[PDB]
From a paper:
Lysine benzoylation (Kbz) is a recently discovered post-translational modification associated with active transcription. Here, we systematically characterize writer, eraser, and reader proteins of histone Kbz in S. cerevisiae using proteomic, biochemical, and structural approaches. The Spt-Ada-Gcn5 acetyltransferase (SAGA) complex and NAD+-dependent histone deacetylase Hst2 could function as the writer and eraser of histone Kbz, respectively. In addition, we demonstrate that a subset of YEATS domains and bromodomains serve as Kbz readers, and structural analyses reveal how YEATS and bromodomains recognize Kbz marks.
To elucidate the molecular basis of Kbz recognition by the YEATS domains from Taf14YEATS and Sas5YEATS, we determined the crystal structures of the Taf14YEATS-H35-13K9bz and Sas5YEATS-H318-37K27bz complexes. In the 2.0 Å Taf14YEATS-H35-13K9bz structure, H3 residues from Q5 to K9bz could be unambiguously built. The overall configuration and binding mode of Taf14YEATS with H3K9bz are almost identical to those of H3K9ac-, H3K9cr-, and H3K9bu-bound Taf14YEATS complexes. Taf14YEATS and Sas5YEATS adopt an immunoglobin-like β-sandwich fold. Both histone peptides are docked on top of the β-sandwich and are surrounded by three loops L1-2, L4-5, and L6-7. In the Taf14YEATS-H3K9bz structure, H3 R8 forms salt bridges with Taf14 D104. Mutation of R8 severely disrupted the interaction between Taf14YEATS and H3K9bz, reinforcing the importance of the neighboring arginine in ensuring binding specificity between Taf14YEATS and histone peptides containing RK signatures (H3K9, H3K18, and H3K27). A π-π-π stacking interaction composed of Taf14W81/Sas5W82, the benzene ring of Kbz, and Taf14F62/Sas5F63 dominantly determines the specific recognition of benzoylated lysine by YEATS domains. Mutations of aromatic residues involved in π-π-π stacking (Sas5 W82A and Taf14 W81A) completely disrupted the interaction with benzoylated peptides. Similarly, the Taf14 A63P mutant increased the interaction with K9bz by 1.4-fold but did not affect the binding with K9ac.
Author numbering:
A (entry chain A): 2 to 137
B (entry chain B): 5 to 9
């Protein structure tokens, strides 16, 4: 495949929920993850190159595989432990799945992580969409 | 803040 590179930015926030009883003295926290695309100047723009995003959460969660179809694909959950996870992003026009490793952790109140992905140029609608975020 | 599962 001919491909182009794009940087996506994963944004995470978390805060303690004091009304939830701590579990084994560990507080329960509310947390969220969203995903934006960066353009070639570094500005956040809606990640419309993805048809859907699936968060593959730690197996302790009820229904750990959460599907979203509208940018910024925001997920909200509660828990008491950090964990690694994979985020599946599905490019437009069945152009392919990319697995993006993330770590959900409580080290900061909010933090951002950038990932470069390679996107094919063989689906006209996706190719047109990619022109919004940089050269193709 | 270092809590892991």
């Amino acid at each position: 495949v001919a491909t182009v590179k794009r940087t996506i930015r994963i944004k995470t926030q978390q805060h303690i929920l004091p009304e939830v009883p701590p579990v084994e003295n560990f507080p329960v926290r509310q947390w969220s993850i969203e995903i934006v695309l960066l353009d070639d100047e570094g500005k956040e723009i809606p990640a419309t190159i993805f048809d859907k995003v699936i968060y593959h959460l730690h197996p302790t969660f009820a229904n750990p595989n959460r599907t979203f179809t509208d940018p910024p694909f925001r997920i909200e959950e509660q828990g008491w432990g950090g964990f690694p996870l994979d985020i599946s992003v599905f490019l437009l026009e069945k152009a392919g799945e990319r697995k993006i490793p993330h770590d959900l952790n409580f080290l900061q109140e909010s933090y951002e992580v950038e990932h470069v992905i390679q996107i094919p140029l063989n689906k006209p609608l996706l190719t047109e969409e990619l022109a919004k975020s940089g050269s193709t | 803040q270092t809590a892991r599962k």
